[PDB]
């Protein structure tokens, strides 16, 4: 048995949807990310209120790819005044640190049965960028990602 993810009552988990394979590569290389203005605010608020008592996990997926491409932990608050033009969208304003945990493709078929009660019971695979995942469903997603081969 694998009971690791069942025993943890803190932590928050968000879906990250990227249009750009380049941005994913840059994020893995440099352990940084940036979302939209409203996405950055949502993640910043979550990281800050955690105050280090548990992780903020990011579940990454490229729009249209049909799979998740990995998992990272948020590792800093959002710095909103950084060098412009480092990403796909040249307007994107800001940067936060991440630490990539798992880099592997996980097909949407492995995950489409998990549904989000905070997003109209839609499959977790049909989420938009910075959709939060309820912790009890996030445990199920993380276990599937960690045991897929």
Residue numbers in the entry: 400 to 548
Give me lines lifted from the publication on this model.
The YTH (YT521-B homology) domain-containing proteins are a family of RNA-binding proteins that specifically recognize N 6-methyladenosine (m6A), the most abundant internal modification in eukaryotic RNA. In contrast, the DF proteins (DF1, DF2, and DF3) are mainly cytoplasmic and play essential roles in mRNA translation, stability, and degradation. Our study focuses on DF2, which is involved in multiple types of cancer, including prostate cancer, MYC-driven breast cancer, and acute myeloid leukemia (AML). We have also presented the crystal structures of DF2 in complex with six ligands, which represent six distinct chemotypes (compounds 3–6, 13, and 15).
The X-ray crystal structure was solved for compounds 3–6 at high resolution. In our first screening campaign, we described a series of uracil analogues; compound 4 is a new member of this series with a modest IC50 value of 250 μM. The six binders 1–6 belong to four distinct chemotypes: thiobarbiturates (1–3), uracil, nicotinamide, and pyrazolopyrimidine. Despite their chemical diversity, these chemotypes feature an NH group that is involved as a hydrogen-bond donor with the backbone carbonyl of C433. Furthermore, they act as hydrogen-bond acceptor of the conserved water that forms hydrogen bonds with the side chains of W432 and D528. Notably, compounds 1–3 occupy the bottom of the aromatic cage with their sulfur atom, while compounds 4–6 have a methyl group as in the natural ligand. Compounds 1–4 and 6 act as hydrogen-bond acceptors for the backbone NH of Y418, and they also form a hydrogen bond with the side chain of D422. This interaction may offer selectivity against the nuclear reader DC1, which features the N367 hydrogen-bond donor NH2 in this position.
